[PDB]
């Protein structure tokens, strides 16, 4: 059943698994019409499909053209997500196919289950974890490839850069979730913390800056402080 705090180490065992987040698939700006009615304009989106063990990110870019002339787009977005995840699994060699797919939102369970009927041995699971993968579009290089796409495109990233050379996949996931939680709670402050020192850059082939082990402890502390402040404001406590 559901993935929670109680079975967290399971993410870093040797059974291939993928998280799927559909938050950024269907994105709109809401605006006034000439007549003073309200309308939406879709912008490019993405499916966030992540192997938490390896850091391998399958970023499927959702071009606005896929919504053209369709109805009930928030419903279609879940089925299009399930169609693309199913296509991704079928494109992988058997030994690379996941044994489990964990959806960050329970509304993805039936669409994914129905698209994966051909794979009865792949378990489709929800999670009780509140994962901040919605903030993926606060990572500059991921936002840039989504917004520039002129057609449907799959782009492959490692969301952990080269961290696994120095740290375990448990620690790499904890760092990623803290960075994304900070970016989600206060994007401006998080981005300031990450780029305030101009001497630490982002490699062409990386997403995040080239921090030493000591600079990561400092960064990680600044992110925790950002999150607690913002919490004391939200709730006046």
């Amino acid at each position: 059943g559901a993935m929670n705090s109680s079975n967290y180490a399971e993410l870093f065992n040797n059974d291939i698994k993928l998280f799927v987040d559909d938050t950024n698939v269907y994105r709109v700006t809401v605006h006034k019409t000439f007549e003073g009615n309200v309308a939406t304009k879709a912008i490019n989106g993405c499916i966030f499909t992540l192997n938490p063990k390896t850091g391998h990110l399958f970023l499927k870019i959702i071009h606005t053209s896929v919504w053209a002339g369709q109805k009930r787009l928030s419903q279609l977005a879940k089925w299009k997500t399930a169609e693309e995840v199913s296509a991704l699994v079928r494109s992988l060699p058997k030994e690379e196919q996941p044994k489990q797919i964990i959806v960050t939102r329970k509304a993805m369970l039936d669409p994914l289950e129905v698209h994966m009927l051909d794979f009865p041995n792949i378990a489709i699971r929800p999670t009780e974890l509140r994962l901040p993968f919605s903030a993926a579009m606060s990572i500059d290089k991921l936002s840039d490839v989504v917004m520039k796409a002129t057609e449907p495109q799959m782009v492959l990233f490692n969301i952990y850069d080269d961290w696994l050379d120095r740290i375990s996949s448990y620690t790499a996931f904890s760092r990623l979730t803290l960075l994304l939680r900070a970016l989600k709670t206060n994007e401006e402050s998080a981005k300031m913390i990450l780029l305030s020192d101009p001497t630490i850059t982002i490699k062409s082939y990386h997403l995040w800056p080239s921090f030493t082990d000591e600079q990561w402890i400092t960064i990680e502390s600044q992110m925790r402080d950002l999150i607690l402040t913002e919490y004391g404001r939200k709730y006046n406590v």
Binding site: Q75, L76, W79, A82, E83, D110, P111, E113, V114, H115, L117, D118
Partner: protein, 300 residues
């Protein structure tokens, strides 16, 4: 008008005949049920006074042979049997009638309830759901599991209802996943009606048989089957007009006949709320919606 004689009634038992029921005392001079209407299937059912667990009974049709009940003290139940000697049977029935040791099937002339519950139910379809081909009658009880329940154990004592599964390759055409899941018309009309049942009469027959097994035996798998067959129609955007009008009549008599005190265990809140208020057919079941709203407004 046909007769099901009883050899004797050695144990205290509540006897059902269709929607009617009678208490018989241990060793009471009870020798059976007369004036049973020809032209319908019937069910004769039992609940022992000393173990109210295991409701059990027999589906039969008096046109197919001469049937009687005899208590078996080894297996501890009332068994249905066929008498092949016509003249012996007629002589047994005539004696018991002359001595007035038989209860009369108590049909009110105005009352079409049993017809309305069994309209599409045929003995030949019952014998395919309940497999025991050496008998012309079919045994059902409270505990018998369905072929679908056995997949999720003794195959011989199973109810072979048609398997309906909304998240199955049978239900969903490759490349029409969202369409087929949100609109079950393909599954209802091509797979189930044209493919398996051949016509709406056979589909309704199984639906009505599943309801009656749920109601008379508290058979949980039957109840699941009755709800699945309702939900498959209500979840289809494209259903023939005659099927919707007939479904409304079927469900109306089922809801009308259900004991008020069993609605809590025999009716699935989710399915009925979905069928009457959210589904494509939310506005197609006028009679059913009115009786449900007036009889079971709590469930909704």
């Amino acid at each position: 008008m046909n007769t099901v004689p009883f050899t004797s009634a050695p144990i205290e038992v509540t006897i059902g005949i269709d929607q009617y029921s009678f208490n018989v005392k241990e060793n009471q001079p009870f020798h059976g049920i007369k004036d049973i209407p020809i032209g319908h299937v019937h069910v004769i059912h039992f609940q022992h006074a000393d173990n109210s667990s295991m409701r059990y009974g027999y589906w039969f049709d008096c046109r197919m042979g001469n049937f009687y009940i005899q208590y078996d003290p080894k297996d501890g139940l009332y068994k249905m049997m066929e008498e092949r000697d016509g003249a012996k049977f007629e002589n047994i029935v005539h004696n018991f009638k002359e001595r007035q040791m038989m209860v009369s099937y108590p049909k009110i002339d105005e009352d079409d309830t049993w017809y309305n519950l069994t309209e599409f139910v045929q003995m030949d379809k019952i014998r395919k759901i309940v497999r025991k081909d050496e008998n012309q009658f079919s045994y059902v009880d409270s505990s018998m599991t369905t072929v679908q329940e056995n997949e999720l154990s003794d195959p011989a004592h199973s109810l072979n209802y048609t398997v309906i599964n909304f998240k199955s390759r049978e239900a969903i055409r490759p490349g029409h996943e969202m369409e087929d899941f949100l609109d079950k018309s393909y599954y209802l009309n091509t797979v189930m009606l044209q493919g398996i049942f051949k016509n709406s009469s056979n589909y309704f027959g199984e639906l009505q048989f599943a309801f009656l097994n749920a109601m008379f035996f508290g058979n949980y798998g039957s109840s699941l089957q009755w709800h699945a067959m309702i939900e498959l129609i209500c979840s289809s955007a494209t259903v023939p007009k005659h099927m919707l009008d007939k479904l409304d009549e079927i469900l109306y008599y089922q809801i009308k006949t259900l004991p008020e005190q069993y609605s809590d265990i025999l009716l699935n809140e989710r399915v009925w709320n979905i069928c009457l208020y959210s589904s494509f057919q939310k506005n197609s079941l006028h009679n059913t919606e009115k009786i449900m709203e007036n009889k079971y407004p709590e469930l909704l």
